[PDB]
Amino acid sequence: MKLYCLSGHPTLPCNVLKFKSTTIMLDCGLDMTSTLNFLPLPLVQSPRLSNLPGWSLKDLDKELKECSGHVFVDSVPEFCLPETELIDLSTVDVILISNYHCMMALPYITEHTGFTGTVYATEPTVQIGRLLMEELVNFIERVPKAQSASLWKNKDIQRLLPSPLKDAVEVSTWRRCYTMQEVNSALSKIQLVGYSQKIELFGAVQVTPLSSGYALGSSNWIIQSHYEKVSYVSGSSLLTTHPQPMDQASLKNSDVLVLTGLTQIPTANPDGMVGEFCSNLALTVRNGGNVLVPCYPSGVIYDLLECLYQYIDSAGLSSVPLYFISPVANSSLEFSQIFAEWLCHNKQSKVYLPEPPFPHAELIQTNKLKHYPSIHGDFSNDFRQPCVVFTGHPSLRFGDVVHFMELWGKSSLNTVIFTEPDFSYLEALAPYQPLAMKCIYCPIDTRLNFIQVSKLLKEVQPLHVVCPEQYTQPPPAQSHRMDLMIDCQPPAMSYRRAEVLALPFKRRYEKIEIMPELADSLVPMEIKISLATVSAVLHTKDNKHLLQPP
Amino acid sequence: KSAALHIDLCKATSPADALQYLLQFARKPVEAESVEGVVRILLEHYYKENDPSVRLKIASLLGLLSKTAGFSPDCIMDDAINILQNEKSHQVLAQLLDTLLAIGTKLPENQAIQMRLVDVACKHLTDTSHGVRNKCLQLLGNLGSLDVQKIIGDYFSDQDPRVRTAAIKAMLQLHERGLKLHQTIYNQACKLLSDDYEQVRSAAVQLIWVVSQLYPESIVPIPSSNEEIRLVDDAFGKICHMVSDGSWVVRVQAAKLLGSMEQVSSHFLEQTLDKKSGACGAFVHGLEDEMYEVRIAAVEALCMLAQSSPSFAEKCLDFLVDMFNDEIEEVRLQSIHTMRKISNNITLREDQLDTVLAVLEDSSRDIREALHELLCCTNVSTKEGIHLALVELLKNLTKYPTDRDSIWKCLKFLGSRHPTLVLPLVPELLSTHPFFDTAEPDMDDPAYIAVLVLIFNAAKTCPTMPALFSDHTFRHYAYLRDSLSHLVPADPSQQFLQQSLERVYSLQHLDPQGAQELLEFTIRDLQRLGELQSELAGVADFSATYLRCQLLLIKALQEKLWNVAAPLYLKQSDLASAAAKQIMEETYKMEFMYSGVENKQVVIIHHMRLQAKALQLIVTARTTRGLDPLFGMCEKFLQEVDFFQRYFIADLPHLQDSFVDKLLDLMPRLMTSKPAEVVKILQTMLRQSAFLHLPLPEQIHKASATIIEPAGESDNPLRFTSGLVVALDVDATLEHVQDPQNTVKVQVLYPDGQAQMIHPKPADFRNPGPGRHRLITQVYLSHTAWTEACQVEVRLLLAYNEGTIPFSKPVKVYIMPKPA
Amino acid sequence: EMEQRVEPHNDYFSTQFLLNFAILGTHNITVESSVKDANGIVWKTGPRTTIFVKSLEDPYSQQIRLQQQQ
């Protein structure tokens, strides 16, 4: 019926679907791209970042520090929340969560907004996003900076700011990182679900999570209320990835298909980017340099660790240690091992044998890949100079990646290789910018590109299509490629942040059940079809109607 | 900017960007008169817009503006009910009812507006939407008519489960606000207890517990029998049946509410722990549930019901014994604690006792300590069981020697409360041969003290046989009485401090040498008094620092540089320049490292700070030849004096003949005077300034800090790879720190010039007592390669609103960054 | 340029400095010993002891640096 749009981010959505007599929030997405405007949080007080020159405005110099012509806020990195004031969040009943990447900011809705409903997500999304929330809170709270800078978030001053800081949107809604007790309270109210499981919400609507194929546990949602169905297609993959393949059959004959989470930089083959990542890694470690891979502890790191496992024996790089430093590294590896039921048929055929499903587990027993909770504990005693480090947050503002770049950026032999497409590569390198390090940008986004989603929409044929505004337009990097947009026979329905969409797909014919006592009392008169005049008393219970004979 | 809001809403666009502008406006506070203005403007703009989302945002913003602090909402209710009169959208109507609920909650005293609002709620309860009915039920629950109970009881049977939960929570809110409920509520909630929805069942069991607590002795008939049952017993049976629910939070709620039904008859209480009506086996089912939260809640329910009913504890006993070995450590902690709680008068027989003594062998220190307090609070017959308890405690002491104090407490409580049973055991414990002279046992051997603590506490209440002791046992009794007296049984300073302070005050007419001698004597006496009376140590060194400030001022004002001219002044033999800096440091130390300061002390502290600033101004004016920098900080000093007279204008008439009031007398001259003449009059007027008095605080302590975890006495370096990080753990004992969350800072100082300052998070400022704080941070250290393990300097700091001062003892830690 | 105020406890003091030599070659370092009395007056009395430090490069590091430069 109605569809509220609390997030403008395409791959980090927060859409509230006011559907019949039940209010459904489709995902909650924390925009961590807001953190790029802030100065990075290091593990130790680096001399270079500490005495950066301040930036002056003739109208604040302690708040703003300029590095290589780009102005950065010297406070803690703040996070752009979904906009929580368009619709009262005490009126929403159910939060459906697709990805663990789209489960961030759940402590913001579930605690600060008076949301008293229930949350549905799969087992692996809840566990992995618990790990990601844990390392995010840890990274913010290792060396606590203060939230000193507040004057730059003013309407008079942010106009005068340069382009990276002026273009930041909804700055007053940015908030500090939530704490660990908020994480625990948010994840305590999640009801765990499995793929193709029917969940009835107050007898009115029926929601099921369908396998999406992007990440292990990641799910698309369909919301059925009698004879009308809403399909929510979040980040999904049509490629041969580790999780269960995308369930395209259950999305069919849907009245409106809300789709989000398409591929950022769609003009990139992920297999070619894996090849480029392995080639650049081999080239760097063959020269005696160092490879730094800023990555999430889960997700694409499993795929690139699989490919690097297949590559090190071919390239002869068995003497090069692979280090995986993360506070949730061991938990991520173990969680990937035990979620075999959520993987594709190739991976879950391996656990029918007494064998680990992911091949990176063999790297620990062969000691090729060593994982540590932190730099300080015993990684500082097991460190060999030519090495590959998978660590830190990919935003390059917090985590162990900051210390590693401050350590290795003064040498041209060392390289950093970017595999996550979530954050802008130039804006990630901007606060470290006078560096001799070679930076390789090879994003391995495996989500749906535009030819794949054109084929999917031709296969499914939804009556209406709801997408973000960025999918109707060409990407601003291209701004001319007409194939890089969503095109359907109806010209879609685009939305921006804080926009309310009215869906005119509401119909008549709510289903009813008639007991056999009334069925005998109705004479099937011949019309030619049949006709019958019925007189009954209507009984409604739990939003399900019954007809009773008087 | 209310007219700006009017112009922007009615001038830019109607449909979409007006919503964006309202969203932008909703994020700023509004003053109360401007609240009235914007409420009038938004309610005028409500009728213009036909878009439902804009009207929903308008209703939400009215609800937000009605919650502002200084705005009385009594003048806007009539327009609110007017816009509810002709509102058709159900979401906007629900938001408007939310606004009306905010209006009613903000004005509890006005009964007429509350009756109007509940009339509106009763009018709008027949709405087809569930959200409107939910908000109307919330409105009735929050305000009511303390008719309302009948209407909410009618709405217990609504088709939507959310409205049913809203009705139950509304009438629960009615009970919580003070209204006494009826009894038909019990039948309605009993019918609703079998609902197909989790939230309805939880709310219904809460309502059942409430109506049972309201009318416990009421008599209700069985629906299927002629016999009559008390209301609290019947509701106890219903909640016991809800203990076996399919939802674990409903089971936790049922167990927790079952713990508070202390008025239940004994018969159902023995029924609920049996294994052979609906109350049978409820606690047996709850103690073996898969979710540990349900088991914990059933443990506290058992504890509350056994504290209420003494006959219930004997049935609780064996289940607690069986559930000591539980897979979750928190569950067995709770079981041991509640077993200690319900061990008031019941005795333990053999198998329960040695099951307790078998689980004494566990490796966890926490449950060992908890079981130690249980053995402190236990009652046991059959003195061979006491011997078994002693043997198990002694072998626990052998296996875990750290728990010797707790084990000695156990044996003290066992001897003190089982005196006659230990008495025949004494020749078996003390190796007393009937005729042989026994060797004296080794003192300071923790098994032997443990035996003696048991024996001596048994001998305290029984003087029947204390002659069984040998001579060396009496000698050891004397030794333990001298050493372990808490286990084995059988204001001149304030007057002197006031006298010394008034001796300083009353002898302020002496020569400078005599004044310096008196101040030195009194500072020494105050320091030694602080070293003697511990509770007066803070006020002693507070007054000592004040007298040190005055002594430094007197010594600086009597320097040889005043007898020479400005060109002949030389700073390489200067003393007053360091003196002014020292007085500044001592004033900051005085203001911020003392807990009991107040305004009546802060004014004298700031007065001494002003005197130090004036002294530094004159000292710097001695060595300056240019006229404009001298004029610059002279103007800065006069600005500081003006800030001081503005801030402390209330207690200005208490500082007679001081520096600041004698400045205030000459202030109009001081603005119009040439700055060198200002410096000269300040130099001549500091020497004539009268010494102030300190109002002594009632309770004042130094902020003390010592770190123990770096432990700077080990020469072993802490090695790590160059360029990587090494973690250092600290443990600070912060004593009498007012706000350690935002003042205590950790400083690490490398051997080079690096002095990295670490701000600890508030999450690990543990507070184990009043005035006591514990700081546990894992500070992070890194540097490139060293040719030798040098040092690092770890120091706690205190920060104040502009600078930081040393706080704790400097501690050195060895660091060896090895190359990669 | 470094400074450390050490306190002698038994008419003997000891402190440790951390000197960085990025520029290769002979580095003449000098150490002073100023004495601060009880009144706070600084007395420059101690010897000006000088030792020369040579910053020799690792052959592997030198080869790596020349390869990166060329």
Side-chain angles (χ1 to χ4, degrees), chain A residues 1-344 347-488 490-495 497-498 500-504 509 512 514-516 518-519 523-524 529-550, chain B residues 1-274 278-442 444-464 466-597 599-624 626-697 699-708 710-712 717-718 720-723 725-801 803-815 817 819-820, chain C residues 1-4 6-23 25-47 49-53 55-56 58-66:
Chain A
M1 173 210 180
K2 292 181 182 179
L3 193 150
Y4 298 82
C5 311
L6 310 190
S7 193
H9 208 283
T11 65
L12 294 164
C14 183
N15 307 137
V16 180
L17 174 67
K18 184 108 195 174
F19 179 40
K20 300 287 98 176
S21 48
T22 305
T23 318
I24 313 289
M25 185 180 288
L26 300 167
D27 289 334
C28 60
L30 191 58
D31 198 356
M32 293 180 183
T33 64
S34 84
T35 64
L36 277 299
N37 310 292
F38 295 88
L39 206 65
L41 285 190
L43 192 49
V44 293
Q45 176 250 329
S46 70
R48 185 190 64 86
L49 280 166
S50 310
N51 49 49
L52 282 174
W55 186 87
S56 312
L57 186 58
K58 269 78 60 183
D59 188 76
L60 203 71
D61 299 9
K62 59 185 193 300
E63 302 203 345
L64 294 189
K65 304 287 194 62
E66 173 209 352
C67 171
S68 190
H70 275 303
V71 184
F72 301 101
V73 184
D74 209 353
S75 163
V76 298
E78 298 170 41
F79 299 89
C80 173
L81 266 70
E83 180 261 319
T84 47
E85 299 303 319
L86 165 63
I87 177 63
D88 187 23
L89 295 194
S90 287
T91 65
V92 307
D93 291 331
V94 161
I95 301 182
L96 299 181
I97 283 177
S98 65
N99 307 321
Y100 46 81
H101 286 308
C102 296
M103 183 179 72
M104 294 296 172
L106 188 76
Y108 289 125
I109 296 89
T110 51
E111 268 71 31
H112 309 99
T113 73
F115 160 79
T116 61
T118 187
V119 182
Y120 294 107
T122 62
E123 176 71 28
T125 50
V126 170
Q127 299 272 50
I128 292 176
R130 168 174 278 279
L131 296 188
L132 296 199
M133 273 171 204
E134 265 163 43
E135 65 154 17
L136 169 72
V137 171
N138 179 274
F139 283 164
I140 299 305
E141 292 180 352
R142 280 184 309 171
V143 191
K145 206 184 270 188
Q147 200 184 9
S148 65
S150 303
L151 308 185
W152 77 278
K153 327 198 201 79
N154 199 8
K155 48 197 308 179
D156 316 323
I157 307 178
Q158 205 195 342
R159 290 175 190 157
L160 294 174
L161 291 184
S163 166
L165 276 168
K166 156 186 175 289
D167 296 339
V169 299
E170 294 294 328
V171 184
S172 61
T173 68
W174 293 5
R175 217 168 301 188
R176 266 189 298 107
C177 182
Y178 47 81
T179 178
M180 186 66 204
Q181 58 100 25
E182 287 173 312
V183 168
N184 291 327
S185 175
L187 303 177
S188 59
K189 54 189 68 172
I190 298 194
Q191 179 168 354
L192 291 183
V193 293
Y195 285 152
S196 294
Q197 166 176 339
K198 299 279 302 180
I199 297 89
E200 272 80 17
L201 307 176
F202 319 107
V205 308
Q206 292 90 61
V207 294
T208 62
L210 314 167
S211 161
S212 73
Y214 177 39
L216 64 90
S218 64
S219 69
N220 295 328
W221 293 91
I222 49 173
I223 306 107
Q224 316 205 30
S225 165
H226 61 87
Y227 320 96
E228 53 250 31
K229 182 172 73 175
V230 182
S231 290
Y232 177 60
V233 182
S234 187
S236 304
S237 179
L238 268 188
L239 312 170
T240 60
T241 59
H242 53 106
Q244 280 192 24
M246 202 204 175
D247 192 6
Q248 293 187 165
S250 296
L251 302 170
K252 295 176 182 176
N253 53 89
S254 65
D255 291 331
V256 60
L257 188 143
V258 189
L259 73 165
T260 48
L262 260 56
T263 308
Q264 306 150 264
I265 186 66
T267 65
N269 183 31
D271 273 290
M273 295 298 102
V274 170
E276 282 194 14
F277 155 78
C278 286
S279 72
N280 285 289
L281 191 138
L283 172 62
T284 298
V285 303
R286 264 200 279 275
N287 285 254
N290 263 306
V291 179
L292 185 59
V293 187
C295 62
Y296 291 109
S298 66
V300 55
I301 179 177
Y302 302 145
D303 308 336
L304 61 83
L305 270 172
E306 186 186 307
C307 301
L308 185 61
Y309 167 54
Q310 303 168 355
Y311 197 87
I312 49 166
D313 51 353
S314 174
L317 308 171
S318 285
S319 315
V320 176
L322 316 172
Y323 295 118
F324 178 31
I325 296 147
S326 192
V328 291
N330 176 42
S331 313
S332 167
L333 301 181
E334 294 294 328
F335 280 18
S336 64
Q337 295 316 115
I338 61 160
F339 287 148
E341 313 94 326
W342 302 82
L343 301 172
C344 64
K347 297 280 190 185
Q348 62 192 3
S349 288
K350 198 154 300 308
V351 295
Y352 295 146
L353 283 72
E355 193 74 26
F358 273 99
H360 69 256
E362 204 206 333
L363 293 179
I364 297 89
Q365 289 102 26
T366 50
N367 290 318
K368 315 307 284 170
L369 166 76
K370 292 172 271 325
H371 67 274
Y372 304 96
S374 60
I375 309 178
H376 58 78
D378 48 352
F379 170 75
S380 69
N381 311 65
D382 302 332
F383 175 60
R384 299 310 144 205
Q385 187 55 258
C387 82
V388 178
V389 180
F390 314 92
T391 190
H393 204 264
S395 70
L396 262 52
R397 294 305 185 269
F398 51 89
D400 312 293
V401 69
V402 183
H403 178 70
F404 274 120
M405 293 178 71
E406 289 293 327
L407 177 58
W408 288 342
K410 306 170 299 305
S411 166
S412 294
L413 314 176
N414 310 323
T415 56
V416 61
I417 298 182
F418 283 81
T419 58
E420 316 282 350
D422 291 331
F423 306 97
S424 171
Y425 157 60
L426 269 299
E427 303 297 321
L429 273 300
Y432 311 91
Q433 185 60 256
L435 54 80
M437 185 180 288
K438 298 187 289 182
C439 316
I440 305 302
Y441 184 56
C442 64
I444 321 182
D445 209 359
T446 65
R447 303 197 223 86
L448 299 187
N449 46 43
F450 286 99
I451 43 168
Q452 274 165 333
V453 71
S454 287
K455 288 203 208 332
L456 169 71
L457 289 166
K458 260 191 195 63
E459 179 69 33
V460 168
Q461 296 95 13
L463 277 296
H464 300 77
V465 173
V466 167
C467 57
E469 278 186 357
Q470 291 86 53
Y471 293 165
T472 66
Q473 302 308 115
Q478 275 81 17
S479 75
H480 71 89
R481 293 199 57 169
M482 295 298 102
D483 49 352
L484 302 183
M485 65 183 73
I486 290 178
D487 199 74
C488 295
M493 293 177 70
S494 45
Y495 63 82
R497 189 182 160 104
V500 187
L501 289 182
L503 302 171
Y509 301 136
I512 211 164
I514 293 180
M515 293 182 286
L518 183 63
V523 176
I529 74 178
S530 305
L531 188 153
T533 46
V534 290
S535 178
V537 56
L538 180 60
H539 173 242
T540 313
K541 186 59 188 331
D542 302 336
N543 295 322
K544 303 189 186 77
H545 317 273
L546 294 174
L547 277 193
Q548 303 166 313
Chain B
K1 296 180 174 178
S2 188
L5 180 137
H6 177 95
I7 287 295
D8 293 2
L9 188 153
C10 78
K11 272 305 168 184
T13 51
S14 44
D17 303 332
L19 173 68
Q20 178 64 227
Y21 182 76
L22 287 164
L23 208 46
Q24 282 172 348
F25 174 74
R27 300 199 214 91
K28 53 199 87 157
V30 186
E31 209 266 332
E33 278 81 5
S34 300
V35 177
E36 282 194 355
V38 301
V39 160
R40 298 270 174 237
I41 288 191
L42 297 172
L43 290 188
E44 274 166 24
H45 292 171
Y46 185 83
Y47 315 116
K48 294 181 183 179
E49 188 68 32
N50 289 341
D51 182 85
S53 57
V54 178
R55 281 175 315 182
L56 179 79
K57 188 49 194 144
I58 285 295
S60 170
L61 183 62
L62 268 294
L64 178 54
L65 289 161
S66 303
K67 284 179 314 171
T68 57
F71 159 68
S72 179
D74 58 356
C75 56
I76 74 176
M77 182 182 59
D78 57 355
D79 308 342
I81 64 171
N82 284 324
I83 71 180
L84 273 74
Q85 190 88 25
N86 48 5
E87 170 52 78
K88 62 95 176 179
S89 165
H90 297 301
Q91 325 181 20
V92 187
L93 196 51
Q95 200 58 50
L96 273 180
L97 269 295
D98 198 288
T99 299
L100 259 62
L101 188 153
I103 298 278
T105 318
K106 212 197 166 72
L107 293 184
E109 296 87 4
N110 203 312
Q111 199 265 334
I113 79 162
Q114 279 189 349
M115 171 287 318
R116 287 208 80 189
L117 290 190
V118 302
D119 267 350
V120 173
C122 290
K123 180 157 186 335
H124 272 300
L125 262 170
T126 58
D127 198 284
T128 70
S129 160
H130 90 280
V132 192
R133 297 199 300 278
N134 203 306
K135 291 315 284 202
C136 287
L137 281 172
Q138 285 186 51
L139 191 52
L140 287 183
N142 279 33
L143 311 185
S145 310
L146 172 56
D147 287 331
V148 54
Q149 288 197 40
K150 186 257 292 179
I151 299 168
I152 299 180
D154 287 335
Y155 270 126
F156 291 168
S157 65
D158 205 2
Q159 55 95 26
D160 204 283
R162 281 159 309 183
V163 194
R164 301 203 280 276
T165 54
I168 305 158
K169 291 174 71 175
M171 185 179 288
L172 284 163
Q173 188 72 26
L174 275 182
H175 156 262
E176 190 258 355
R177 279 181 43 236
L179 177 79
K180 257 167 65 181
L181 315 167
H182 295 158
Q183 209 185 0
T184 313
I185 170 168
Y186 179 82
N187 285 264
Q188 303 171 57
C190 171
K191 293 198 284 306
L192 205 50
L193 258 183
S194 59
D195 203 82
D196 292 305
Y197 285 80
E198 183 178 1
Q199 42 268 27
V200 194
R201 281 195 312 275
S202 68
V205 75
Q206 177 86 42
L207 191 69
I208 280 292
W209 173 77
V210 171
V211 68
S212 69
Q213 287 322 288
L214 285 192
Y215 305 132
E217 307 296 324
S218 284
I219 301 297
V220 298
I222 304 177
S224 54
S225 314
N226 194 298
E227 291 84 4
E228 319 283 318
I229 306 299
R230 270 203 312 154
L231 190 54
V232 60
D233 288 353
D234 197 17
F236 195 87
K238 304 273 161 163
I239 303 184
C240 287
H241 181 59
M242 294 298 103
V243 172
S244 164
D245 204 74
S247 184
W248 70 276
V249 290
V250 177
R251 302 197 289 261
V252 168
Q253 186 65 255
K256 284 168 71 70
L257 297 167
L258 212 57
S260 298
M261 309 191 72
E262 61 256 5
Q263 315 94 23
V264 65
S265 171
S266 80
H267 183 208
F268 296 91
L269 265 182
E270 291 100 12
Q271 279 179 223
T272 195
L273 266 185
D274 286 339
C280 290
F283 278 153
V284 191
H285 184 265
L287 286 195
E288 63 188 3
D289 194 359
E290 46 171 357
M291 295 299 291
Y292 80 102
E293 304 93 336
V294 193
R295 287 181 294 182
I296 278 174
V299 162
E300 289 103 13
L302 275 183
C303 170
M304 295 298 103
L305 284 175
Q307 279 173 16
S308 168
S309 164
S311 61
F312 193 42
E314 290 91 350
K315 267 76 65 180
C316 294
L317 183 63
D318 47 346
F319 289 96
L320 287 179
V321 175
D322 270 333
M323 185 177 177
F324 278 177
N325 265 22
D326 193 89
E327 60 169 25
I328 302 295
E329 303 292 295
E330 188 49 56
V331 176
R332 60 192 302 178
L333 284 169
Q334 204 60 42
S335 75
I336 294 162
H337 285 317
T338 59
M339 176 82 108
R340 177 188 46 81
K341 286 177 192 169
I342 67 168
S343 66
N344 57 5
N345 296 115
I346 61 170
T347 71
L348 285 174
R349 33 181 194 76
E350 183 205 30
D351 62 358
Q352 310 152 342
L353 183 44
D354 65 3
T355 303
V356 171
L357 298 163
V359 299
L360 188 51
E361 280 147 356
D362 186 75
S363 65
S364 162
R365 201 177 83 260
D366 292 331
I367 62 170
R368 262 189 278 125
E369 287 144 358
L371 193 65
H372 280 149
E373 290 102 13
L374 165 63
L375 283 175
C376 288
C377 294
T378 192
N379 298 340
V380 61
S381 63
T382 180
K383 72 169 179 63
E384 49 256 17
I386 281 172
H387 177 74
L388 176 58
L390 176 62
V391 171
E392 267 296 324
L393 272 163
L394 284 190
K395 68 182 287 186
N396 176 38
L397 186 48
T398 305
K399 202 177 148 42
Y400 294 100
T402 314
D403 291 330
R404 57 160 165 100
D405 304 332
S406 59
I407 288 178
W408 290 343
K409 288 269 307 170
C410 292
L411 291 171
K412 168 205 179 178
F413 272 101
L414 280 177
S416 76
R417 283 177 322 118
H418 313 81
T420 74
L421 285 89
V422 178
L423 190 61
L425 199 64
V426 185
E428 321 185 6
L429 305 188
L430 315 178
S431 183
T432 307
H433 210 90
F435 47 89
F436 278 152
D437 293 326
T438 69
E440 178 170 349
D442 174 51
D444 305 336
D445 185 74
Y448 178 65
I449 296 89
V451 167
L452 277 190
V453 162
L454 182 63
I455 291 301
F456 291 151
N457 288 278
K460 163 195 52 177
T461 56
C462 281
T464 70
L468 206 48
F469 296 158
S470 66
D471 46 349
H472 55 253
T473 49
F474 274 116
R475 295 201 294 269
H476 296 151
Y477 166 72
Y479 168 58
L480 276 296
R481 279 295 296 168
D482 291 331
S483 51
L484 276 298
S485 61
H486 66 287
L487 298 174
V488 58
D491 47 355
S493 294
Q494 176 60 231
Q495 202 272 330
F496 181 83
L497 187 137
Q498 293 159 358
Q499 208 147 16
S500 73
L501 284 190
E502 67 95 18
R503 183 184 315 125
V504 163
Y505 294 150
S506 75
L507 271 76
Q508 281 309 299
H509 49 252
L510 309 181
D511 50 347
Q513 195 58 259
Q516 286 169 29
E517 191 193 328
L518 169 70
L519 283 170
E520 280 155 32
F521 280 160
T522 301
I523 281 157
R524 185 180 67 190
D525 280 338
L526 282 178
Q527 274 165 6
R528 180 82 167 109
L529 177 71
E531 295 162 22
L532 284 175
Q533 179 74 257
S534 196
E535 56 94 16
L536 286 190
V539 67
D541 46 51
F542 184 86
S543 307
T545 44
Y546 188 56
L547 295 193
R548 198 166 314 122
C549 288
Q550 179 67 20
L551 170 65
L552 285 166
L553 197 57
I554 288 308
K555 287 204 298 194
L557 283 179
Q558 285 311 299
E559 273 296 318
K560 267 286 150 198
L561 63 90
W562 318 110
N563 288 318
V564 308
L568 304 191
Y569 165 69
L570 73 165
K571 73 163 54 177
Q572 62 102 34
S573 68
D574 195 6
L575 195 142
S577 51
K581 175 249 291 181
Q582 283 164 25
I583 300 173
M584 294 299 291
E585 295 174 352
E586 294 293 328
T587 42
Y588 287 134
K589 205 179 67 58
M590 185 180 289
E591 193 186 332
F592 294 109
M593 293 178 70
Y594 287 87
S595 60
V597 307
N599 194 15
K600 62 187 183 302
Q601 292 104 22
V602 159
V603 64
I604 296 89
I605 294 170
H606 282 229
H607 182 274
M608 185 63 72
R609 188 167 299 142
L610 266 189
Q611 284 181 148
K613 279 169 183 176
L615 178 79
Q616 192 142 51
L617 160 64
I618 303 158
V619 161
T620 51
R622 291 294 287 197
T623 189
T624 45
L627 74 164
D628 46 349
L630 188 153
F631 170 75
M633 73 290 291
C634 166
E635 287 271 356
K636 184 216 178 192
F637 168 74
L638 271 296
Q639 188 180 8
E640 270 158 337
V641 176
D642 183 32
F643 175 73
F644 179 84
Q645 65 182 357
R646 265 182 275 114
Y647 195 85
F648 290 100
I649 202 163
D651 42 1
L652 277 178
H654 303 112
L655 321 178
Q656 281 68 61
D657 291 331
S658 72
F659 181 63
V660 61
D661 67 331
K662 288 220 259 207
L663 271 189
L664 291 203
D665 299 351
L666 303 169
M667 185 64 72
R669 182 163 148 84
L670 273 154
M671 283 74 74
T672 75
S673 166
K674 186 251 290 180
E677 201 76 18
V678 175
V679 168
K680 291 307 288 172
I681 200 164
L682 283 178
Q683 182 204 137
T684 58
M685 96 172 290
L686 293 174
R687 307 204 185 93
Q688 267 280 341
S689 163
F691 185 35
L692 279 189
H693 295 233
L694 264 184
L696 289 176
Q699 267 290 91
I700 178 169
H701 303 283
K702 269 193 76 71
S704 176
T706 52
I707 62 170
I708 57 174
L718 186 62
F720 71 108
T721 305
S722 310
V725 193
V726 65
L728 183 63
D729 277 316
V730 302
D731 276 328
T733 310
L734 313 175
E735 195 72 32
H736 303 121
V737 189
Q738 293 271 264
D739 201 1
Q741 320 296 322
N742 299 110
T743 53
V744 177
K745 305 291 170 268
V746 186
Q747 178 188 3
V748 298
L749 164 69
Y750 294 97
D752 61 352
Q754 292 310 104
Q756 160 178 22
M757 183 177 177
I758 290 159
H759 313 258
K761 62 184 178 180
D764 58 2
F765 275 106
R766 289 84 154 90
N767 180 80
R772 286 164 69 254
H773 287 83
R774 272 286 305 278
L775 167 70
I776 315 175
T777 61
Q778 197 187 47
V779 306
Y780 297 112
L781 276 75
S782 84
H783 188 273
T784 72
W786 295 359
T787 197
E788 191 172 336
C790 311
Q791 284 179 356
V792 65
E793 184 67 33
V794 177
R795 179 98 64 93
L796 291 181
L797 293 187
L798 198 78
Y800 49 88
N801 63 330
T804 178
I805 71 168
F807 190 34
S808 82
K809 187 71 177 176
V811 173
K812 298 178 177 178
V813 184
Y814 272 99
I815 295 298
Chain C
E1 294 216 57
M2 294 177 70
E3 188 272 331
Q4 271 174 18
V6 65
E7 209 279 327
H9 62 87
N10 55 352
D11 277 347
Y12 162 76
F13 60 96
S14 176
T15 186
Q16 197 164 4
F17 286 99
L18 183 63
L19 272 77
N20 173 40
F21 300 114
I23 294 179
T26 303
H27 281 275
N28 173 42
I29 76 171
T30 176
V31 56
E32 298 289 332
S33 294
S34 298
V35 165
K36 189 173 282 197
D37 65 334
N39 302 329
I41 307 164
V42 172
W43 304 85
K44 306 202 183 304
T45 76
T49 308
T50 61
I51 48 165
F52 300 98
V53 187
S55 308
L56 78 167
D58 205 37
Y60 189 69
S61 86
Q62 172 169 10
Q63 176 192 74
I64 284 302
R65 193 186 41 82
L66 294 174

